[PDB]
Amino acid sequence: GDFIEDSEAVVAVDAVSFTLLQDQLQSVLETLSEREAGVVRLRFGLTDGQPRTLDEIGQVYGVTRERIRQIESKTMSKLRHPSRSQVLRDYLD
Amino acid sequence: NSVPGAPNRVSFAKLREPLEVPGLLDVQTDSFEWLVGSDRWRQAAIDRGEENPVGGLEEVLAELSPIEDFSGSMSLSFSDPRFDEVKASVDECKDKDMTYAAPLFVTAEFINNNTGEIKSQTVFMGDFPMMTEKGTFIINGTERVVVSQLVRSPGVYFDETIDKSTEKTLHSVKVIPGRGAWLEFVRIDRKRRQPVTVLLKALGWTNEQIVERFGFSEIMMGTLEKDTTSGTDEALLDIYRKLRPGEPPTKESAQTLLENLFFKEKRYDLARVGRYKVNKKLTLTEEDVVATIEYLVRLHEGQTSMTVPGGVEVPVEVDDIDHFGNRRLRTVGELIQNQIRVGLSRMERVVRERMTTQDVEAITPQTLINIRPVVAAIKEFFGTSQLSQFMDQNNPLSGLTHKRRLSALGPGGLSRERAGLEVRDVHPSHYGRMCPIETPEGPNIGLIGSLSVYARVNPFGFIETPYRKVENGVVTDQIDYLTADEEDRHVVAQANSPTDENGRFTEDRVMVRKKGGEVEFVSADQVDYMDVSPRQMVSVATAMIPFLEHDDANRALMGANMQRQAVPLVRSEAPLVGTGMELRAAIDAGDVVVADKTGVIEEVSADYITVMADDGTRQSYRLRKFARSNHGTCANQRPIVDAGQRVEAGQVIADGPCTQNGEMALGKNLLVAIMPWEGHNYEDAIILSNRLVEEDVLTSIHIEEHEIDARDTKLGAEEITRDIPNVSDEVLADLDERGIVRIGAEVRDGDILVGKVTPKGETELTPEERLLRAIFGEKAREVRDTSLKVPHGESGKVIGIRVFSREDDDELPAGVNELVRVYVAQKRKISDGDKLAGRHGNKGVIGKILPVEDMPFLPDGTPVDIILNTHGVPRRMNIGQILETHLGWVAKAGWNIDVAAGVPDWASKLPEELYSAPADSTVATPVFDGAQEGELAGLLGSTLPNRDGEVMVDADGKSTLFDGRSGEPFPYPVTVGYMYILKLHHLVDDKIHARSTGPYSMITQQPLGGKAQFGGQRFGEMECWAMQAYGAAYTLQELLTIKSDDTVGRVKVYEAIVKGENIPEPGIPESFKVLLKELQSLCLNVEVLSSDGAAIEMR
Amino acid sequence: VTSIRIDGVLHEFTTVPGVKEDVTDIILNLKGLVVSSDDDEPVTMYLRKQGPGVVTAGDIVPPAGVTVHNPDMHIATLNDKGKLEVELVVERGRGYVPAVQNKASGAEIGRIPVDSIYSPVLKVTYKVEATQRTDFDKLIIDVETKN
Amino acid sequence: VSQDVIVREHDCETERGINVTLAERGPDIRDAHVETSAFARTLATDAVDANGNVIIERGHDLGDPAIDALLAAGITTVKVRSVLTCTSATGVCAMCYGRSMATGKLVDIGEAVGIVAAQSIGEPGTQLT
Amino acid sequence: VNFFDELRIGLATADDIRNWSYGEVKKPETINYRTLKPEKDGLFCEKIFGPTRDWECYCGKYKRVRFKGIICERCGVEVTRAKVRRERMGHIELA
Amino acid sequence: KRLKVVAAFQQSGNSPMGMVLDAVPVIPPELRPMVQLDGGRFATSDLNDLYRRVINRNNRLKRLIDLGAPEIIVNNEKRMLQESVDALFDNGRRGRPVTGPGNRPLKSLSDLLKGKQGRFRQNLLGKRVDYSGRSVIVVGPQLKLHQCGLPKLMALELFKPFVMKRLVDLNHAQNIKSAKRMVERQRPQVWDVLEEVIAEHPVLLNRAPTLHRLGIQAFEPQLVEGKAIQLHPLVCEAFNADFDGDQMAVHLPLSAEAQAEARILMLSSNNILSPASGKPLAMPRLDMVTGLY
Amino acid sequence: LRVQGPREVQIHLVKEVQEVYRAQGVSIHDKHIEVIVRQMLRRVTIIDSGSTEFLPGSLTERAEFEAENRRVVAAGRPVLMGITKASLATDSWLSAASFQETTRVLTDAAINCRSDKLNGLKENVIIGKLIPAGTGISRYRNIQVQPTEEARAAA
DNA sequence: GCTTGACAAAAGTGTTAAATTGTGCTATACT
Ligand SMILES: [Mg+2]
Ligand SMILES: [Zn+2]
Ligand SMILES: [Zn+2]
């Protein structure tokens, strides 16, 4: 019985790097327009942890779901832009 | 010698072996051949001894036949066991993880006494594991050995213990059967307060018979005079309530109780050993229970002779349980027989009951027979039993001594903890039977031992030793094998006593052993038998220590143990100074290839060797090549013969792992210097020439086995694949299509061997993780990565791959689709930290290895390979290691006489034909007749040159070494020579461990120990004591909180080191929280109170 | 000699059909090769032998600018089925350099790295004799080489 | 049994002690062991020769010089501070315990001398036949 | 806290035992032979001892940390860390 | 004697009723886990079969009570119920112990606490620890008394989180993830970094068995080639260290206090005399005697 | 003990113990032995209460016996007891449980309703507290450090 | 800079069939 690993045990190096990843995102997001960053956070549920539908994010900014879908595509090609993405690469897994 | 291809190794023995060493694997093969009773055993017991040989299988089958219920209306009879040809070959089984077995068949006859009908049916008992030529079994693919157990033979044994209080004498007799309750004098079934007289009447004998039979016994009359039992049936009642308390008896039950307990054959088991022991010494007979009490009364009285009332006279004396006459030794065949007997009796239960509820005339031998419990006994015996062990093979010698081991532990014997030191001590009767010098150093000492060289096992389980009988001061060629009982009968002449012409006593008086055994000096007049040769008492490994007679038993034991600890080298050089056994121990081990017919070699390949016999027949032998052994050593074999070569039956065609030219080579011959050197070789440490690295003289290979399977999971099927969810294409660079490492690849710690994947869900990815997915566009994959990687701290080249697929027909346990095994191998150069040793018990780690440039080096410019510290030698009584260091130099440089004109005085006793040997010739000094001190000196001067005629060593075995560091000579002459040193299975690569963070235990959060788990070190009770004595509270707290059990604190501390912040304050150890919970579960209310507020909650 | 490549074998621990020596016991033999090279830069030698016989260093065909100084040396013994095709790489250096693993170098799965001994010299000793008062010292050194 | 015994204070101040034999009856000759008994201790009371001059004051460490000095004056016994007589409420006191065998000086106030005693006693036990 | 003063013991009364308990385990059942999930009311039951996964009820209707400390009206499992599965006790009421 | 028990119940508020159980607590599931090993086969604590007998018998008792049943049957159930709760708490303490397959007795709740393998000695008074290693030891003759040879591979793993930080400080690695891979693959840059972090950072060395506190001492680590541990020859006496192949454990003190205790209290050169006889220990011996003699 | 009195038993036991170790060539300073012997004499048998609060035949600590026996406005005798029996008498119930006879200890503790103050060092080890010895003593662990104003000036 | 409508995938939701699971029962006589 004492040879069994605990698979749900917290690994220190990951929780720390996850803390560090949570830092780098907060920074990269600061390079986006207030609404651009705000839409990404709600879309993926960064702050709350609860993701939101395009219609729901359109409800906070007062637009259609399609408008949000558009703003989403743009900020993502902005995020995909190498100057923003270069730093997050090593967090692949 | 006497072996066809035997290499030429000159002996100093002054005697002649009258008897070749017996086949020393015999103890295993004979026991098994008896169990299966093949014609090879038939002829043996027919051509001598009893005329009705009964195989072990038939023997246990006679006990079953017939099966008859209380009615006797039906009888199920068994007979005629039969085996088919072995399912698969040994090689095939080790590969396919099956067990080497022959199916067994039986004839089952069921008879109905009412209808008089007969039903004969052939029955399949199961696959019965067979024994290899080498004396082993293949159980689920692993080679295993069944060690023989030491036990107390059934019989009546008396012991005299002085009264703890009155100091008066008392016996105290015991009778131990094969099976059933045991009695002691009547204290029975562990029920005290029982007079021995009350039962003597329970049989129905009237008191006058007591006064008639008791006779001269005074306490025999006073016990019946004191006993208040009146009548034979009333005594059975005083016996009935003590034996069966709680049950009101019946005259039918009161009488049958005693009859059924012992006399009845079913409940009480007469042993052939017990039946033979007491029948001569005096199922169970009423006649026998009287002679018991009679023997006892005539012991405490002091008479040495008891003539039974109607019986024959025998000595009345105490018995010794440690005397081998009373101690067997249940061999492998019997250990199997007993486990079969159990399996049948469990089946007889289902056969008996089955008859009742089965519709009659619808019952057949099969319908009553269910074989589950019979095969289970066998399978459950080989696994989980302590007498069935994984064969110990790092070298042929280790394997050969594993068989031939006899241990007193196991089921049917005493536990390791209870037995006292009286059984561990060597008895005088161990001589020539069980080697006294060989046992474990751990707290198994004396419980495990190895059978002697000439020892042989009796059909009854008693060890016999060969002797040569002497008559009228003349030793005959008659060789008689005697047990311990018949050895106490006679006077055993010493092995070496001067021989006279055609042979007879020369020395005025003879060395002899008495029945004490107490040694004595008497003339040639009174002797009967003599020893077959020196080293009868010694075992195989013990007999392999040159100059054994010069080393204290302490260091000798260590020396034997460590020979079986060595590891096969790539080169495998044989010992320069040997003993007798090296030749015959390697062939009898089976790790060498021997030819069974005279003939000539047709082909020699690294892969196989074929020989064309004079018989016209054609024999071929496939060579084991880089085969991984049980513990990871290398079994590689090499052919020693060439195409044209003629060869003779029993010769050696190919060398095994540790052998060279037919003799055991457990190590290399090295040039040794015994000076202390600059504090490097100190306190048993050793220093080495870097030559031993560059030239791969101590190098050895090693092979690890890695295994992974793809099974069916509730969420899908596991798939071996090359696709891994998150990796660079670099890690996969060495994987083939299917995702298994390519043969010939190089693998580091953490490299992938077999890629595997298992389904996962529902995942619920973290938001921070799902954002990167959108950005870099890598779909979160459907499955987790569970893949086979190489353990931390390991490395090598990929040797071979074995794949078993369900898609392919193959075979596998339910749920397992695919199994792939990967074999990694590495060359291990001799490394600082590895453990080396000689045959004398001298051991040490390599502390340093120097450039061959700076080393003590002889006048030739010949560097020494090893520098051994002078200080360890003198106090350890191992000085034999200095002798062989001298002889080693002799054998390496050659020598001459000493003649002319005449032969010098020392050589007179006498080296024969030994007067000259060339350079590099190999020597043999059998243990108890070896070279002698005089003969060493005479040889020590001899012979030049290095090349130039100058001599490098004097008659003291010393030389002037030049320091390779400063270049100046060492002020004094130093001893140099050649010593035989072995590389041992403790290696630094395996023993170096380190951990920072890693897996934790499930129930306790502590790190889990062992290298497999990447584990941490145990800081124990005693370590905490030391910490407390220092007064380091913060160190002690740290080790016990944030370095093990503190689940939040251990991740914080990491967070602190990586950010270079201060290390935080520790929390509560999880183990303590667990303790509170475990006490609560006992209904113990445990509250943790503060100063107040009273109860604190752990959460 | 640094590394070696044998067509049939992908690694050190197998056999070759018809050859008496296993690949590892052959590498041991090739250790005793005493070669010499003008160098610089690595250069491959070549050895191919068929049919029965005994292979030796003489059977090694050196490239232009290298030579084998003990062709008498036994490598492997071959039989009717034995065929041995092996190339050897000779580099230049000094001392003893342990086999460089091809994971560290750029080599592929086929290359067998081997321990390399670059030591022209074999065995060396010396001695001195003074020049009585006025004594001086004269030393003799005994130098032997591998050829 | 001894693990909770630690030095809790500098001085309990008791005058109590035990009488060490410090040889005897000669010449007409140190006790075979004054090294494990008298040395390292601290004097409970002044050591006085006849009639006499008080050759060593109470509280002295009793090194090697002190035993030589005392021996000259002809003192065949000395009263010494011991943890047996120590009156400390908790633990024992430095003065009563005496010199630390490790430091060679008065024991430190943190020292846990029970564990050290336990180990000092048990360690050689392997050598006890 | 890591600093407590006293630590006390006593006989646990049936009432103490019942107060510790987060439920009475009524069945000698460990886990389902097919799904391998904890059987309700048995040993391991998530309703009493706790959730197998963090902030995940047995059925899953409430899967999110958004509402901790609410019980699923269907499966009756509480939404919180699976760590409580280590801290929580049951009881048996003897007949 | 009988008073000692009767008196004990007066002063405490404990109702003596507690010695009879109306209800039995049940231990949390993770302390009696059931988990599948690698390959899917399952393993669980003995506690669960023990709890199973109890609840099985209690439930049968309820059943017989409700039907109505002759006392012989009902009383038999209560006797069985009593024995099962015994086995649960302490198995074999009365009668033959409840056994599983192979006739090995099941581990009771009492079996957890008691013995060398129980909670106290196994998991409480000692335990396995992070930031530790071991290897075989070799002689240190060139070392200063306060130093030890540490295998560089061993040092690397021991200090892994330290160097990971350092090589992120120096720009060798851009993020912690890269730093971790850089150490695992042992890229050559790390070595120079290791010497930095290891400098003047002490470590504890222990050899079992630990007899006196001197069986643990702090030293100054020195990166050493090879997989063995270089031990100063003057500390053999205290550790009772044979070079016949003994091994020693290394422990890395972390907090400032722990490192202070190492340098001040446990440092090799500050512990010379035995703290029993006061005689010198690190004093020369063996070779060093005959050399000076 | 009964003849020569408590302080003389100590002298005897130290001499006796010290004789075995002297026989085998071992040097142990008497104080180490004295530390151990001191723990055997620490209790006294209570012959009469008389108004206590103590029970006859019970072994109570000498200091705890002296103070509560005063009771403002109960006789015993010095008691020798071996180290094993002595350590079981210790006031820490979880210290006694970890030592030996765990079940016996826990059952007597739960009936006496025992409260452990966690003063001893083994107790603090088990719970992860700082042992009350060496650097863990209050006077040392509460040390406050600041640089001298003279030092801050030099900066 | 954003919105509309057409639209298909995705996700729920209710409705039904299939499977899984629980329980009762078996009457030569048998203790
Ligand atoms: Mg040792
Ligand atoms: Zn004091
Ligand atoms: Zn739910």
Author numbering:
A (entry chain F): 374 to 466
B (entry chain C): 21 to 205, 215 to 311, 323 to 1139
C (entry chain A): 51 to 181, 185 to 200
D (entry chain D): 879 to 906, 910 to 1010
E (entry chain D): 4 to 98
F (entry chain D): 294 to 586
G (entry chain D): 1123 to 1195, 1202 to 1283
Which of the paper's sentences describe this entry?
To provide a structural basis for understanding mycobacterial transcription initiation, we crystallized and determined the 2.76 Å-resolution structure of a 446 kDa Msm TIC containing RbpA, σA-holo, and an upstream fork junction promoter fragment. RbpA comprises four structural elements, the N-terminal tail (NTT), the core domain (CD), the basic linker (BL), and the SID. The RbpACD makes extensive contacts with the β’ Zinc-binding domain (β’ZBD) as well as with residues flanking the β’zipper, structural elements of the RNAP ‘clamp’ module near the N-terminus of β’ that are conserved among bacterial RNAPs. The RbpACD/β’ interface buries a surface area of 615 Å2. Together with the RbpASID/σA2 interface (954 Å2 buried surface area), RbpA forms a bipartite protein/protein interface with holo that buries a total surface area of 1569 Å2. What is evident from the structure is that the RbpA/RNAP interactions position the RbpABL (residues 70–79) to interact with the DNA phosphate backbone just upstream of the −10 element. In the Msm RbpA/TIC, absolutely conserved RbpA-R79 makes a close (2.2 Å) polar interaction with the negatively charged phosphate between the −13 and −14 positions of the non-template strand (nt-strand) DNA, explaining previous findings that RbpA-R79 was important for the ability of RbpA to increase the overall affinity of mycobacterial holo to promoter DNA and for normal RbpA function in vivo. In addition to the R79/-13 nt-strand DNA phosphate interaction, RbpA-K74 and K76 are also positioned to make long-range electrostatic interactions (5.4 and 5.5 Å, respectively) with the t-strand DNA phosphates between the −18/–19 and −17/–18 positions, respectively. Thus, RbpA enhances an intricate network of interactions between the ZBD, the zipper, σA2, σA3, σA4, and promoter DNA.
